Amino acid sequence: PDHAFSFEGIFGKYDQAQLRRGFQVYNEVCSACHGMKFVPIRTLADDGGPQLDPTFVREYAAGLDTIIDKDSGEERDRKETDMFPTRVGDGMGPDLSVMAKARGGPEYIYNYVIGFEENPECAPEGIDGYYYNKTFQIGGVPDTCKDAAGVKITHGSWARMPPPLVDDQVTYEDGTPATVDQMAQDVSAFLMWAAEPKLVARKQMGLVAMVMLGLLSVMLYLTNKRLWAPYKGHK
Amino acid sequence: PDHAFSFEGIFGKYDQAQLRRGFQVYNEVCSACHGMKFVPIRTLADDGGPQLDPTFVREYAAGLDTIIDKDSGEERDRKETDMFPTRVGDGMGPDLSVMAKARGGPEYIYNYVIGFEENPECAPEGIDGYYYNKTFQIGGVPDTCKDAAGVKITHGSWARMPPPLVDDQVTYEDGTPATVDQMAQDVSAFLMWAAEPKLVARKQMGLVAMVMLGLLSVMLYLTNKRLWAPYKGHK
Amino acid sequence: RRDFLYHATAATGVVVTGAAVWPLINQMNASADVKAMASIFVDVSAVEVGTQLTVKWRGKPVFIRRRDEKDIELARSVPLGALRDTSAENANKPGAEATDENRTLPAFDGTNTGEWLVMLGVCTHLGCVPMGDKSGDFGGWFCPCHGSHYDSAGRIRKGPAPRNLDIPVAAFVDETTIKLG
Amino acid sequence: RRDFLYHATAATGVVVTGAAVWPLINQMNASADVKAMASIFVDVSAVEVGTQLTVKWRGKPVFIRRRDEKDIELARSVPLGALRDTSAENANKPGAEATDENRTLPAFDGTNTGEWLVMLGVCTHLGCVPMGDKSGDFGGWFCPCHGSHYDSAGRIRKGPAPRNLDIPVAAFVDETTIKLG
Amino acid sequence: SGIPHDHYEPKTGIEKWLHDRLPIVGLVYDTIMIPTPKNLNWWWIWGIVLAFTLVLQIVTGIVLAMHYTPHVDLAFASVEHIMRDVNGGWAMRYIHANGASLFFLAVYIHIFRGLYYGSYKAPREITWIVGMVIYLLMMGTAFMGYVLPWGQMSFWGATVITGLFGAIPGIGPSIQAWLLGGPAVDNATLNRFFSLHYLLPFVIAALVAIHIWAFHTTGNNNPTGVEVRRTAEKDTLPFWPYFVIKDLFALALVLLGFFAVVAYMPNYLGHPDNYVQANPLSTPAHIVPEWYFLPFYAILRAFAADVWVVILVDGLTFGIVDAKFFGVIAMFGAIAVMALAPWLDTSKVRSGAYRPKFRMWFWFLVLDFVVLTWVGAMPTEYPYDWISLIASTYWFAYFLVILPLLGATEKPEPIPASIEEDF
Amino acid sequence: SGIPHDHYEPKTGIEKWLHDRLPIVGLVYDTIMIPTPKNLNWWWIWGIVLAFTLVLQIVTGIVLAMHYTPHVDLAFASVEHIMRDVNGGWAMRYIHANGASLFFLAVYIHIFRGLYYGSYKAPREITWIVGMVIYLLMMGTAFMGYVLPWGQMSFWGATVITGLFGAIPGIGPSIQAWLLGGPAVDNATLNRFFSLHYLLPFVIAALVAIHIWAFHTTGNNNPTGVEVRRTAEKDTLPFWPYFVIKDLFALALVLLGFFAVVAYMPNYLGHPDNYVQANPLSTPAHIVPEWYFLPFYAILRAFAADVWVVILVDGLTFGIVDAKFFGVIAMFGAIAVMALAPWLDTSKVRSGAYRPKFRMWFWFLVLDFVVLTWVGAMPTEYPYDWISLIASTYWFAYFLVILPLLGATEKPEPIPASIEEDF
Ligand code: HEC
Ligand code: HEC
Ligand code: HEC
Ligand code: HEC
Ligand code: HEC
Ligand code: HEC
Ligand code: FES
Ligand code: FES
C-alpha cells in the first residue's frame, strides 16, 4: 500500500543497506545538480546510518570537487572534515540537506520522483524547457488547464527538474532489482538520514524516559494515595 | 621639540588640512603595500576629519581595486560603502587601521618613518633584503652588534620596510614645503584619524560631563553640609 | 532657601538622569554601517541608451533600462484590458492605473517619460531574476524559474506571476544620476 | 514499609534527576564538528622522498620532508656546541638533547631515523612560515619575515628566532601513513 | 489564624546561629508551610508546571547560547551544528522550542481556571495585574526567539509584527526603524532580539517573585466563594508535603507526555518553512506566525471594512483612525480589557460554580478562544471573515457588558459555607 | 531598639489597599530608614559605588551585545563596528572596560576597610563568606570578558589561565578540554565565555541581595568596637536622607573622575597588544594578563624551586605535588585563608583603631598587596623572585599566624564606649 519505510514508527533504526543503495544513487545521479552543504562527509562512518569504511570515505572525498580554503586561497584536496559540495545555479537546484523536513516528508520525495508521466489530454504540447509532474504542487500550470478562477485541474504541476531515472539506471553491488521504485525509496531514506541522523537515539531516549517517568509517577501516586488516606476514608 | 600634534591635549580637533595632506600621501605611497580594511570609504565625508566632497569620494573609490561581492561572485565597482582594500602578502605589510593604538602611538610612526639612516660602524655591510631603522625595536640584529648576552647595542633594529620617501616625493595642492618631516607628521595624523575618528566628540562629551557632574557634586555638598549642621555645631 | 535649593537639586538630578538615559535609546537607532545603505546613487553616464543597466541594492538588483522605440510603441499600445495587474506597482505615486505615461518614470527634471524605466528586477512570483535584453513572447523579460512573460513596461503577462515589476521611489539628480531610496 | 518505600522514592527521584542533568554537562564537551580534528592522518604514499610534504592542520602547516644524504651528513655533523636551542623541541619524547638521532623521527615501526623528519612549519620568532627546498646559509629553511636561518634538522640558527622547529606528537601507521595528534 | 509557625529557631545551635541570615525562617514559616485549603481540584497545579517550564527554558537556552551565533550568515549553520555535532543537541532545541508551547498551553489553563473561580475578584487584583504583565513579557520573548534561527518564517513574522508599530500615524515609522535597527530586517534586529531574548526571562522570574509574594499574602482562591476563616482553622492543611506531592505527580505525568512528544512528534507544532534559509525576495504561502498568537492575529486581520457590522466605515469619521490602527487598538484592547476585568464584574459573589448564566457564557468564551485559534490560520476569504468578526465581538462583549449584567441579576444559587466541605 | 517603624499603613486609602502586596512596607521599614550610626567616615560609601558600577556594567553590556558577534572571524570587526558606526560606541566600550577597573579598585577598598574595622569578626561571618563568593564570581566574569574582543592578549591569557586547571594530575586535561570545548582555544571557548559572561552578573545581583539582607539584619560595623546599644538609641540616625546624600556626593565625585579618565586617559589601563588580531602561531612579549590578577599571578609564578626557602624541594616528598600544582594550591589558599579569617583572629576585640601592632601589620599588608601588583608585571629574573616569595610568605603569615598572636597579647588600649562620640 502506502509503502511505509522502516523508520516510520516507534522503532525502525534506519536499515543501512537501504542507505548505502541511496548513496550509490545520490552521488551518481542527484549530485549532478543538487548538493548537501549541511552534511559533513565523516558522517558516513558515524553509527545509525551507513557505517561505511573510513578509508573509502577519504577516497570518495578526495575524488569530489575542490573546496578551496578558509585561510589561504588555494584549491585543496577536500578532506572529509569539509562538507559535501554545493550546486547553486545555471540549471541547478536547491540543497537536499533538510528537504525531508521542509515538506509526511520522504513520502513527498518518493511520490515526486515517482511521477513524471507525459503531458495529459488538456495540454499535450506542454511547455518548452519545463517538464510535468503529478505531485509537485508549487509549479506553473497552462491557462488551458486552469478552471474559471485560476485553480488548476491537474493533480500536480510543471517542475523544472527532469526525470532523474530510467528503467535500470545503475547496478547494486549487493544484488537487487534496481528498478525506479526501489531507487526512489532508497534515496528518500538517504535524504531522511541526511536530515535526521540522530533518529534512533531519539527513539531510545524516548523509551528510557517514558519508562523512568512512568515509574516515578506510579510511586508518587502511591505516596499521594497514602498521605491522603486518613482524609478520604469515611466518605 | 617633541613636535606635539594638534590633538595632543584636552583640545585639538584634528586640523583637517593636515589630514588631507596625509591622505594625498597614504593613497600614493603607503597604499602600495599597506591597507586599512577596518576603514570605510564613506568616512572621508563624516565630520571631525577630512570633510571631503562626496563625489570625489565615489570617484576615488571606483578608481581603486575590485572588491568582488558577498552574494554573487562578480568583480564589482568597489562602491564606497565597502572598505579600503587589503594588501596581505608577498612583500607586503600589516594593516594600518589601528596601528596608532597598538603602539605614545603616532609619535612612534613619526620617529619610525623618520629614521632609516645608513648602517652604523659596527656592521656597515648590513643585511641583504633587510634595511635599518633607528626606532623599530622588534627586528633582528647581527651578532656583530649584540652584546655578550644577546642584547643589541643599536638604538633600533632592522625592519623589512624600505625607506618610503625621498626629499620631495609629492606635491601639495594647498602650497607647502613637502619635505619628509611634514609628510611623516601628516600621515601620522591621518592614521590616528583612521584609528580614533570620534576623538573630538570624546573631548566634548568629557567637558560637558565634567561640568554637569561638578555642578551636581557641589549641590550635593551644600545639601550635606546643611543636613549635618545641627550635629556638627557645638564641636 | 528651602524650596529653591531642594527643587533645584531635584531638577539637576533629573537632567543628569535624562542625559544618561538618551544614549541607551540612541544606540538602538541606525548605526553608521547602515545609514549609507538607505541612500544609493547610480551614475547613468551614457549607458548606451537602449540595452540595459543593473545595479545591486538591498540585496536585489535594480534594473535601469533606456527605451527602444519599438519597445515603446508596443508599450503605449497596451489597453488596460487584458492586463493582469493594472495597478502600476511603482511606489513613487498613488495606485494610478498601470499606464505607460505614469509607469515609465519621472522626466529627468524635464518633461518626458517614454525614454527611461527603472524597476525592481525581482519576479513577483517567488523572487527570481528575469532575463532581459528583449526576451519572451512579448518583447520584454522572461523568468526562467517558472515561465512568466513580462511586457515592455514590466507588467506581468503569460504566467503565474500575479503582479508586474514594482518601481521603487526614485528621483533624478539633474540629467546624469539616479537616486534609489 | 514506611522507611523502605519513602527512601526508595527519594532514590528513584535522585537517579532520574542525575540522568537528566548529565547531558546538560555533556553537551559542553567536544562536539562532533571537533572530535575529528584531533586525529589527522597524512598518507605519505611515495612523496618522491627528498623534496618536501606540507599539510594543513590546526590552522598551521605540518612539514613532512624526507632526507637527502647531504642534508643528513650536515645534520649529524653538528655538535651541541654553537647550537642556539639544544632542547629538541619534539614533544614525542623528553627534553633530551637536540640530537639528530632523537630529533629526526620514529623509525617507521622499524629501526632507522635518518630518513624522515616532520616538524611544525611555524617560526618560533613570531609564527611565520619559512621557505623550504634547501634555502638560507645552512642548507635548510629561511624565514622571510625577519631573516632566521634554520638548519637541516630544523634547529634555529643565525637570527632572532630563539628555538628550533618543534615536533608534534606523531607515530607511524605501518610504513605508509603518518598520525598527527 | 494564618499560623506562620516561625519554628522559633529552637532546633539546635545551627538553627540559632542562623539568626544572622534569617533565610530558613522565610522558607519554613512562609513558602513551605503555607496553609492551603483542602478543597483543591487538579486545576491548581499549573503554577508549578509554569515554574518548572520556565526553569527548563532558561537552562536549555543558556546551553544553546554556547553554540548559537547571532548573525545572518552563521545562525542556521550554528543551529545545525547543534542538532548534529553537539552531544544532546536535538534534545535541547526540541525541549526549548516545544516547552514554549507547553508554557503557553499551561498559562492558558492557568488563566481560564482563574476566570471561572473568581481569582481576579477582590482582594486579588495585584496578582492579576502582574500576571498580565508577565503574559506580555513572555509573548514578546517567544516572538524575539522565533526569529533567531533565521529561517524563512522568522523573517516575515518579524516583518509584519513590526509593521504593526509602523501602522500608527506620526510616530510609527520612527518606532519601526528604532526597533529594527534600520528600515528593514537585518543582522541588527537579530542582535537586539538575541540580547533581549536572553534578558527578559530574569525579569519574568522577579515578576514571578512578586507573583508568589502576593498570593502568599493573599489566600489561594479555593473552589468556593469562601476564605480560610481566620479566627483554629481545622481546615487549610499545609502545602508541604501534601500539595507538593500532588503537584509533583501531575508534573511527572505532564513531563512524560512532553517527552513522548519531543521524541516522536517534535516537528508537529512547527512550521516546515522555518527549515529553509531566508530569502527577502520571496515570500511563502500561509506564513501563519505561530499558534499562541493566532487569536490576536485574527482580531487584527478581521476588521477590514468588509461587513455590515464594519465599524471601520464609522471610525473613519476621524481621518486618522484608519483600519490598521483600528485593528491594532482592537488587539491591545482585547488584552487591556482582560486586565481590567476585576473592576468590571460588579458582583459581590465568587466562583461561577454558583452562577449558571456565567457558566454558559464562560464555556462560550472558551469556544471562542478555540475558534479564534483555528481561524488565524485560514484565509480572509468568505466565510471566515464573518466568523472572526463574530468571535472578536463576543470576546469584547463578554468582558465589557456581560459581567456587569450578571453581577446585577445573577444570584439564584445557595453559596456554600464551611470551606471544610466533608461531603 | 531596632525601630523598624513600619508606618502602620496609615497614610491613606492607597497605602491601605497596598495590604495586598506589602512592597512599600519593605522599602520604608527596612531598606531606607535603617538606623545607621553617626560615627561613619568616608570609607562606608564604596558599597554604593559598587552597586552603581554593577548596574552600569550590566547596562552597557546589554547594549554592546546588540552589536557584538561571538565568532573568531567577526568579533574584532564587530568591536570596530561599535567604536565607529554605532551612536555612542566608544562611550559604551570605554565605560564598560574601565568600569571593570573601578569595580575592582572599589572592592579592594571595600575589603581592606573591612579588615581594619573588624567587619569579618563575629557576628558578621555570612557577609564575609558571601563577599568572597562574589569576588570569585566577578573575577571569573572579568576573565571571560577580556577574551571576547579576540585580540592577542585575550588568546594567551585564556591559554595560560586554562592550563592552570590542567596542571593538576589525573583530572587536569579532562577539565581543560571540557572547559575550552576542545584541546585548545577556538570559537567554542568564545561562545561559552560570552554566554557565561552574559549570565553571571545576575547571580552576582542575587548574591548582592543576600549581601544586603545580611548587614541589614546585622548592624553596620562602625569605626568603633561597639554596637548601636539596642535597649531609645539617641544615636543611630537613619539612612535616608543623610547617608544617602553623603554617598551620592562621593559617588558624583567618583563618576567625575571616571569620566575624565574615559575621555582623556581611556587606553591607559589597557594593553595595546589587544588591538592586533590573534595569531595562535606568535606570542607577544610580556603578556601581563591584567592589573586585578597580578597578585595571584605572582603568587603562582613565584614558587619555582629557585630559593633556599624553596618549599617545592620539600613538597616533592610526594611525587604528585610538583611545582605547578603547588602554586595553584598556593593561590587558592591565598583566597581561602582570607575567607577563613573570621575563625583565625582569636581576639575578643574589634577595630584596629585600638590595636597598634595590628595597625603596623595591616599597613605592611597593604604594602604587600601593592608590591605583588607591581611584581606580576616584571620578569622572573633576579631579584624579583626573592621579592615575590617574601611578599607571598608575608601574606600567608599575616593571615595564619599573626592574628592569633595578636588576639592573645594585643590589648594595650582603652576601648571607647557610647557610640555617640560627641567629641
Ligand atoms: C538536474 C539535471 C537535476 C538532477 C539530476 C536532479 N535534480 Fe532535483 N531539482 C532540479 C531542479 C532544477 C529543481 C527545482 C524544480 C522547480 O520546479 O523548482 C529540483 C527540485 C527537486 C526537489 C524539490 C521539489 C520541490 O517540491 O520543491 C526534490 C525533492 C528533488 N529535486 C529531488 C531530486 C533527487 C532525489 C534527485 C536524484 C535522484 C534529483 N532531484 C536530481 C534539478 C535536478
Ligand atoms: C612596501 C614597499 C611598503 C610600503 C611602500 C610601505 N610599507 Fe610600511 N611596512 C612594510 C613592511 C614589509 C612592514 C613590516 C616590517 C617588519 O619588519 O615587520 C611594514 C611596517 C610598517 C609599520 C609597522 C612598524 C612596526 O613597528 O611593526 C608601519 C607603522 C609602517 N610600515 C608605516 C608605513 C607608512 C606610513 C607608509 C607610507 C608612508 C609605509 N609604511 C609604506 C612595507 C611597506
Ligand atoms: C539563555 C538563553 C535563552 C533563554 C533564557 C530562552 N531562550 Fe529561547 N532561544 C534561545 C536560543 C539560542 C534560540 C535559538 C536556537 C533555537 O531555536 O533553539 C532560541 C529560540 C527560541 C524559540 C524558537 C525555537 C526554534 O527552534 O525556532 C522560541 C519559540 C523561544 N526561544 C522561546 C523562548 C521563551 C518563551 C523563553 C522563556 C520565557 C526562552 N525562549 C528562553 C535562547 C534562550
Ligand atoms: C494573567 C494571569 C496570570 C498569569 C499569566 C500567571 N499567573 Fe499565576 N496566578 C494568577 C492568579 C489569578 C492566581 C490565583 C492566586 C490566588 O488564588 O490567590 C495565580 C496563582 C499562581 C500560583 C499558586 C496557585 C496556583 O494556581 O498554582 C502559582 C504557583 C503561580 N500562579 C505561578 C505562576 C507562574 C510561575 C507564572 C508564569 C511563569 C504564572 N503564574 C502566570 C494569575 C496569573
Ligand atoms: C550584557 C552583557 C554584559 C554584561 C552584563 C557585562 N559585560 Fe563585559 N563584555 C560584554 C561584551 C559584549 C564585551 C565585548 C565588547 C567589549 O570588549 O567592550 C565585554 C567585554 C568585557 C571586558 C573586556 C573589555 C575590552 O574591551 O577588552 C571586560 C574586562 C568585561 N567585559 C568585564 C565585565 C564585568 C566585570 C562585568 C560585570 C560584573 C561585565 N563585564 C558585565 C558584555 C557584558
Ligand atoms: C570579600 C568581601 C566583600 C565583597 C567582595 C563585597 N562586600 Fe560589601 N560588605 C562586606 C562587609 C564585611 C561589609 C560590612 C557589613 C557590616 O558592616 O555589617 C559590607 C558592607 C556592604 C554595604 C553596606 C556598608 C558599606 O560598606 O557600604 C554595601 C552597600 C555593600 N557591602 C555592597 C556590596 C556590593 C554591591 C558588592 C559587590 C558588587 C560588595 N559589597 C562586595 C564584604 C564584602
Ligand atoms: S519565480 Fe519568477 S516566475 Fe516563478
Ligand atoms: S617571524 Fe619567523 S623570523 Fe621573524
JSON list of N, CA and C in Angstrom, two decimals, chain E residues 126-149:
[
{"chain": "E", "resi": 126, "resn": "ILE", "atom": "N", "xyz": [-3.80, 42.52, 42.41]},
{"chain": "E", "resi": 126, "resn": "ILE", "atom": "CA", "xyz": [-2.38, 42.66, 42.11]},
{"chain": "E", "resi": 126, "resn": "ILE", "atom": "C", "xyz": [-1.86, 41.43, 41.38]},
{"chain": "E", "resi": 127, "resn": "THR", "atom": "N", "xyz": [-2.26, 40.25, 41.82]},
{"chain": "E", "resi": 127, "resn": "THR", "atom": "CA", "xyz": [-1.86, 39.02, 41.14]},
{"chain": "E", "resi": 127, "resn": "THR", "atom": "C", "xyz": [-2.26, 39.07, 39.67]},
{"chain": "E", "resi": 128, "resn": "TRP", "atom": "N", "xyz": [-3.48, 39.52, 39.40]},
{"chain": "E", "resi": 128, "resn": "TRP", "atom": "CA", "xyz": [-3.97, 39.58, 38.03]},
{"chain": "E", "resi": 128, "resn": "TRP", "atom": "C", "xyz": [-3.14, 40.55, 37.20]},
{"chain": "E", "resi": 129, "resn": "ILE", "atom": "N", "xyz": [-2.90, 41.75, 37.74]},
{"chain": "E", "resi": 129, "resn": "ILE", "atom": "CA", "xyz": [-2.10, 42.74, 37.03]},
{"chain": "E", "resi": 129, "resn": "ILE", "atom": "C", "xyz": [-0.73, 42.17, 36.69]},
{"chain": "E", "resi": 130, "resn": "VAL", "atom": "N", "xyz": [-0.06, 41.60, 37.70]},
{"chain": "E", "resi": 130, "resn": "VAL", "atom": "CA", "xyz": [1.27, 41.04, 37.50]},
{"chain": "E", "resi": 130, "resn": "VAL", "atom": "C", "xyz": [1.23, 39.93, 36.46]},
{"chain": "E", "resi": 131, "resn": "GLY", "atom": "N", "xyz": [0.16, 39.14, 36.46]},
{"chain": "E", "resi": 131, "resn": "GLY", "atom": "CA", "xyz": [0.07, 38.05, 35.51]},
{"chain": "E", "resi": 131, "resn": "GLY", "atom": "C", "xyz": [-0.07, 38.54, 34.08]},
{"chain": "E", "resi": 132, "resn": "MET", "atom": "N", "xyz": [-0.86, 39.59, 33.88]},
{"chain": "E", "resi": 132, "resn": "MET", "atom": "CA", "xyz": [-0.97, 40.15, 32.54]},
{"chain": "E", "resi": 132, "resn": "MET", "atom": "C", "xyz": [0.35, 40.75, 32.08]},
{"chain": "E", "resi": 133, "resn": "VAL", "atom": "N", "xyz": [1.04, 41.45, 32.98]},
{"chain": "E", "resi": 133, "resn": "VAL", "atom": "CA", "xyz": [2.36, 41.97, 32.66]},
{"chain": "E", "resi": 133, "resn": "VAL", "atom": "C", "xyz": [3.27, 40.84, 32.20]},
{"chain": "E", "resi": 134, "resn": "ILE", "atom": "N", "xyz": [3.29, 39.75, 32.96]},
{"chain": "E", "resi": 134, "resn": "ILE", "atom": "CA", "xyz": [4.11, 38.61, 32.59]},
{"chain": "E", "resi": 134, "resn": "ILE", "atom": "C", "xyz": [3.72, 38.11, 31.21]},
{"chain": "E", "resi": 135, "resn": "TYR", "atom": "N", "xyz": [2.46, 37.74, 31.03]},
{"chain": "E", "resi": 135, "resn": "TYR", "atom": "CA", "xyz": [1.97, 37.30, 29.73]},
{"chain": "E", "resi": 135, "resn": "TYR", "atom": "C", "xyz": [2.53, 38.15, 28.60]},
{"chain": "E", "resi": 136, "resn": "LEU", "atom": "N", "xyz": [2.48, 39.47, 28.76]},
{"chain": "E", "resi": 136, "resn": "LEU", "atom": "CA", "xyz": [3.05, 40.35, 27.74]},
{"chain": "E", "resi": 136, "resn": "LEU", "atom": "C", "xyz": [4.53, 40.08, 27.54]},
{"chain": "E", "resi": 137, "resn": "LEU", "atom": "N", "xyz": [5.28, 40.04, 28.64]},
{"chain": "E", "resi": 137, "resn": "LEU", "atom": "CA", "xyz": [6.73, 39.84, 28.54]},
{"chain": "E", "resi": 137, "resn": "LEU", "atom": "C", "xyz": [7.05, 38.54, 27.82]},
{"chain": "E", "resi": 138, "resn": "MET", "atom": "N", "xyz": [6.35, 37.47, 28.17]},
{"chain": "E", "resi": 138, "resn": "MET", "atom": "CA", "xyz": [6.65, 36.16, 27.61]},
{"chain": "E", "resi": 138, "resn": "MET", "atom": "C", "xyz": [6.21, 36.05, 26.15]},
{"chain": "E", "resi": 139, "resn": "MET", "atom": "N", "xyz": [5.12, 36.71, 25.77]},
{"chain": "E", "resi": 139, "resn": "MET", "atom": "CA", "xyz": [4.79, 36.80, 24.35]},
{"chain": "E", "resi": 139, "resn": "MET", "atom": "C", "xyz": [5.91, 37.48, 23.58]},
{"chain": "E", "resi": 140, "resn": "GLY", "atom": "N", "xyz": [6.33, 38.65, 24.04]},
{"chain": "E", "resi": 140, "resn": "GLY", "atom": "CA", "xyz": [7.43, 39.34, 23.38]},
{"chain": "E", "resi": 140, "resn": "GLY", "atom": "C", "xyz": [8.68, 38.49, 23.31]},
{"chain": "E", "resi": 141, "resn": "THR", "atom": "N", "xyz": [8.96, 37.75, 24.38]},
{"chain": "E", "resi": 141, "resn": "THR", "atom": "CA", "xyz": [10.12, 36.87, 24.42]},
{"chain": "E", "resi": 141, "resn": "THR", "atom": "C", "xyz": [10.03, 35.81, 23.32]},
{"chain": "E", "resi": 142, "resn": "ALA", "atom": "N", "xyz": [8.96, 35.02, 23.34]},
{"chain": "E", "resi": 142, "resn": "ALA", "atom": "CA", "xyz": [8.79, 33.98, 22.34]},
{"chain": "E", "resi": 142, "resn": "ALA", "atom": "C", "xyz": [8.89, 34.55, 20.93]},
{"chain": "E", "resi": 143, "resn": "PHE", "atom": "N", "xyz": [8.37, 35.76, 20.73]},
{"chain": "E", "resi": 143, "resn": "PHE", "atom": "CA", "xyz": [8.48, 36.38, 19.41]},
{"chain": "E", "resi": 143, "resn": "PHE", "atom": "C", "xyz": [9.93, 36.64, 19.05]},
{"chain": "E", "resi": 144, "resn": "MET", "atom": "N", "xyz": [10.66, 37.33, 19.93]},
{"chain": "E", "resi": 144, "resn": "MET", "atom": "CA", "xyz": [12.08, 37.57, 19.70]},
{"chain": "E", "resi": 144, "resn": "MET", "atom": "C", "xyz": [12.83, 36.27, 19.44]},
{"chain": "E", "resi": 145, "resn": "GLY", "atom": "N", "xyz": [12.35, 35.17, 19.99]},
{"chain": "E", "resi": 145, "resn": "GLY", "atom": "CA", "xyz": [13.08, 33.92, 19.90]},
{"chain": "E", "resi": 145, "resn": "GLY", "atom": "C", "xyz": [12.82, 33.15, 18.63]},
{"chain": "E", "resi": 146, "resn": "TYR", "atom": "N", "xyz": [11.57, 33.15, 18.17]},
{"chain": "E", "resi": 146, "resn": "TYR", "atom": "CA", "xyz": [11.26, 32.50, 16.90]},
{"chain": "E", "resi": 146, "resn": "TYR", "atom": "C", "xyz": [12.07, 33.08, 15.76]},
{"chain": "E", "resi": 147, "resn": "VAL", "atom": "N", "xyz": [12.68, 34.24, 15.96]},
{"chain": "E", "resi": 147, "resn": "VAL", "atom": "CA", "xyz": [13.42, 34.89, 14.89]},
{"chain": "E", "resi": 147, "resn": "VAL", "atom": "C", "xyz": [14.84, 34.35, 14.78]},
{"chain": "E", "resi": 148, "resn": "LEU", "atom": "N", "xyz": [15.42, 33.90, 15.88]},
{"chain": "E", "resi": 148, "resn": "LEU", "atom": "CA", "xyz": [16.85, 33.63, 15.91]},
{"chain": "E", "resi": 148, "resn": "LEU", "atom": "C", "xyz": [17.32, 32.61, 14.89]},
{"chain": "E", "resi": 149, "resn": "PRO", "atom": "N", "xyz": [16.58, 31.54, 14.59]},
{"chain": "E", "resi": 149, "resn": "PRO", "atom": "CA", "xyz": [17.07, 30.57, 13.60]},
{"chain": "E", "resi": 149, "resn": "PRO", "atom": "C", "xyz": [17.26, 31.14, 12.22]}
]
